[PDB]
């Protein structure tokens, strides 16, 4: 049941040491690749980072940026992050066996929308394969882009650490859908 | 049965029957989408279900006018693709589809647009599971459609999703092999 898959899927920010088989990641990318896209451009590109040194560099640049963000954040965002016990620390960037970086092709019509739609497919596929993920979005994408030698034609959309879930925290609530009809 | 099979089978539907699916089939898809992740768990999607024939007509005509101008002016890669596929500015699915599902994003929420499009991915798979078809329709100017439905300033129209039973839709277009790199470019 698709609803069961979607309902059960939750953020995973803590992963086991063991590396899942690459085939499970590739399966999820093949699922995502079947998604629609503006002018069927398929504007998604994937980079799987496994190198330990590289993961550490990515972790460090992101944590540096997050530190500044956490020092400056306020209001509703600050309150939410505080209540959920978030901090600038992102150990999963080093500890996840894979970092799946998802890029969009700048030139494609509705490229960014299309890649995010495909990320929806991707996350469901990872859940199907029993893997965990978090759509991590650091304050500064450019530093991470440079670390992996991103071509100028591509834009990093999200970093998805992927691994076996390790006693993840509970899914947050979902308010019921409240639809409107015809007009507001 | 794999998710891959569902994703693989799902394709654009621009040809709809007029027969009205039960509301619960559409609502099911929204319920699935609503389970999606979002920035700060804001759940920044809002759904407007348009069924009124006069209103669908207004939306269709405003979109068609915008498309007509677009087709007269578009050049380059998108023009080449539309031309080869013999697309035109006429949008009969905006009349034929029993539902136009207008999907909005809450502007104030962090990563609102990303989150809504992610949820749209869930939504399309759910519609496929229910045997419904759709197309993420993105007219050249959303502002005129927004005004037609009295969109509050807090919300941005992201996509118009005509939804209904497929009426022998055209085949899925090809997919290039997924492009995967390791560590660095
Ligand atoms: C962001 C986005 C915007 C789209 N906008 C339109 C549109 O304005 N008109 C249209 O006919 N199809 C639109 N589509 C549908 C695409 O043309 C379609 O997904 C693509 O041709 C692949 O179709 P397939 O899955 O049937 O192969 C859109 C799709 C996406 C993802
Ligand atoms: C566009 C987007 C960006 C996100 N960015 C982050 C992030 O930067 N850091 C993080 O820990 N989680 C991030 N998340 C995960 C959300 O916090 C998560 O989806 C939300 O809290 C709901 O989680 P749940 O499905 O487990 O209830 C992001 C999610 C989305 C959709
Ligand atoms: N909105 C126009 C053109 C069009 C068509 C398909 C597509 O994937 C994209 I992006 C744009 C039309 O609907 O004809
Ligand atoms: N990137 C920061 C803050 C954060 C956290 C969760 C979230 O859903 C969103 I949008 C932002 C962090 O990872 O802590
Ligand atoms: N990050 C952008 C918002 C944005 C813009 C375009 C787009 O296609 C999508 I998906 C999201 C910003 O905050 O400005
Ligand atoms: Cl998540
Ligand atoms: Cl094509
Ligand atoms: Cl489509
Ligand atoms: Cl919450
Ligand atoms: Cl009508
Ligand atoms: Cl916006
Ligand atoms: Cl069709």
From Swiss-Prot, chain B:
Organism placement in taxonomy: Bacteria, Thermotogati, Thermotogota, Thermotogae, Thermotogales
Record CDD domains: iodotyrosine_dehalogenase
Name the UniProt record assigns to this protein: Iodotyrosine deiodinase
Keyword RNA-binding recorded: no
A Gene Ontology biological process term: tyrosine metabolic process
Positions that bind 3-iodo-L-tyrosine: 40, 67, 71, 91
Underlying gene: IYD
PANTHER family: IODOTYROSINE DEIODINASE 1, NADPH NITROREDUCTASE
Species, as recorded: Thermotoga neapolitana (strain ATCC 49049 / DSM 4359 / NBRC 107923 / NS-E)
EC numbers on record: 1.21.1.1
């Amino acid at each position: 049941m698709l609803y069961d898959l979607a309902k059960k899927r939750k953020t995973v920010r803590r992963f086991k040491k063991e590396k899942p088989p690459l085939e499970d990641l590739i399966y999820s990318l093949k699922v995502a690749n079947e998604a629609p896209s503006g002018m069927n451009a398929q504007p998604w590109r994937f980079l799987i980072v496994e190198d330990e040194k590289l993961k550490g560099q990515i972790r460090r640049v992101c944590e540096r940026s997050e530190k500044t963000f956490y020092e400056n954040v306020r209001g509703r965002l600050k309150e939410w992050l505080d209540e959920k016990r978030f901090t600038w620390r992102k150990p999963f960037l080093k500890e996840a066996p894979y970092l799946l970086l998802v890029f969009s092709e700048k030139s494609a019509p509705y490229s960014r929308e299309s890649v995010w739609l495909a990320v929806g497919y991707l996350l469901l596929a990872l859940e199907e394969k029993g893997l965990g993920s978090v759509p991590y979005t650091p304050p500064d994408f450019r530093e991470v882009e440079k670390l992996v030698n991103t071509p100028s034609e591509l834009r990093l959309e999200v970093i998805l650490p992927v691994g076996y879930p390790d006693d993840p925290k509970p899914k947050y609530p979902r308010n019921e859908v409240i639809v409107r009809y015809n007009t507001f």
